[PDB]
Amino acid sequence: MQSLTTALENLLRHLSQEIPATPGIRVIDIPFPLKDAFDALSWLASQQTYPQFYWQQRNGDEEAVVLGAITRFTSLDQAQRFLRQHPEHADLRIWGLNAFDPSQGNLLLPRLEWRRCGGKATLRLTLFSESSLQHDAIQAKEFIATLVSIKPLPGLHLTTTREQHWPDKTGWTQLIELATKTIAEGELDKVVLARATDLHFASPVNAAAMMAASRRLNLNCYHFYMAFDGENAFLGSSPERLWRRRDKALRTEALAGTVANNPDDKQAQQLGEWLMADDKNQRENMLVVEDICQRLQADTQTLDVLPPQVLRLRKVQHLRRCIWTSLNKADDVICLHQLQPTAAVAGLPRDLARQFIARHEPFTREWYAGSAGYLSLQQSEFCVSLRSAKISGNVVRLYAGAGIVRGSDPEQEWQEIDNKAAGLRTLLQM
Ligand SMILES: [Mg+2]
Hints:
monomer, alpha+beta, Anthranilate synthase, 11 helices, binds magnesium ion, Isochorismate synthase MenF, magnesium ion binding
């Protein structure tokens, strides 16, 4: 990175004299040796420029860091319009978030992108201008000059100042009770209802160190972290894919239905068997397959829903049914608007569930249960923003949700959302 800063500089001096004073984009790819292990997260955390986005594939074999926004997008829709004016760079990637409401996003064209696939990495610098590439070359130089060498990343040393649930247990029970009562009206089939837990600390929270702690313990999860700026962040470790797209081949999953994990393998496996056989959870999952299959009918070709599998995580396990289809169009706005929010996350029918949530949830989910990842012309991948946290100075808001369906027992659902909140909370309160 010392060497690559140097190589980037050397490159930039030359370009800033040669490149034309015309609008456009250059993409500069430099191989990034992983001869020596490089901790991208703790590197990113060293930097003083914003915004910053961290993302790791759930399989752990794809990892990215982006630093600085050439452009900011308020929706995936806006980002795709931009990509489509640049068909010549089909692998140009925009990175970041969709909020719970999929029509609002915070996505970036990264100034600097470190991306790893496997045991191999690339540093990409991009130059973009509306007026002059020559111009943006000099901004690029100043950006580089901003770079700071890697410092070690401290573990969290946090003193809890304040705690509050929205809703609390008492309020949760009446809510779940209300929700089941409403489902018993025969029109609403399912609603997913969540709790925000505001945690205040004696000091500001290092979101990057929170992210690292989660990557260390929350295995088999996608990790996403956006630093909006130095005081504000959204991150999490989610087991769930919204979609992945390679040209036209589309992958999604119905992931819904939960039991506790146990550290002991047999017990975990037996608990998973209980889940597979459980009517209530079966139905909780089947309602997602129904929603997803319907939502995708008009815009896709032959659909394959696989049999349910149990997916095992640090504190929780889930039923999961992969889904494969082909899009009619290679279009990420069709993917996001058809899919998000699925009945795993909002409910069914979509309208009645969205309305119930708008009416009775004592907080706005904002980034919670949206989506995180990247799109480019050729491929994209987003996860669902579950198992996630919004950090505001010294407050961490934790989110957890439970799908409500006929037969939901409030006390069991409280226990569910606690097990979900725990994957992140236990990192903050040792
Ligand atoms: Mg559940």
